[PDB]
Amino acid sequence: AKIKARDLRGKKKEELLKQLDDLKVELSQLRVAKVTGGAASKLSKIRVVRKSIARVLTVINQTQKENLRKFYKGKKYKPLDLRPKKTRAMRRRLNKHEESLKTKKQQRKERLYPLRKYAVKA
């Protein structure tokens, strides 16, 4: 009955919110136990329940972001958090298309005078 992220992948949002609430109720009881003289087993359960709480929130956040990215896939403007991070300097670079652009004067020069392959006899 341990919580594993794989088991949680396909579930609905409200189903995970319910599962989250049960763990949060459980942790609060354990925190009451921590000060009323609960056995070592209950104390050790705190860390197990805390990471179970993290796992559920992780799967909720991940699932929500996955669908937001699908939502904004075809959109021109996306939320700043859905745009590539990279580094600040790399985000300000000329993009792929802009770097490939050449003036018509340079395109004609390359067509008429392409660098050739040759050899010189020894």
Binding site: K12, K13, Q64, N67, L68, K70, F71
Partner: peptide
């Protein structure tokens, strides 16, 4: 049975936050 077990594409609009849904409608 226990001894047996212990030895072995599109947007889901329900996961979109409400606020985004309100903005589009």
């Amino acid at each position: 049975e226990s001894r047996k077990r212990k030895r072995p594409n599109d947007v889901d609009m329900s996961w979109i936050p409400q606020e985004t849904l309100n903005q589009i409608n």
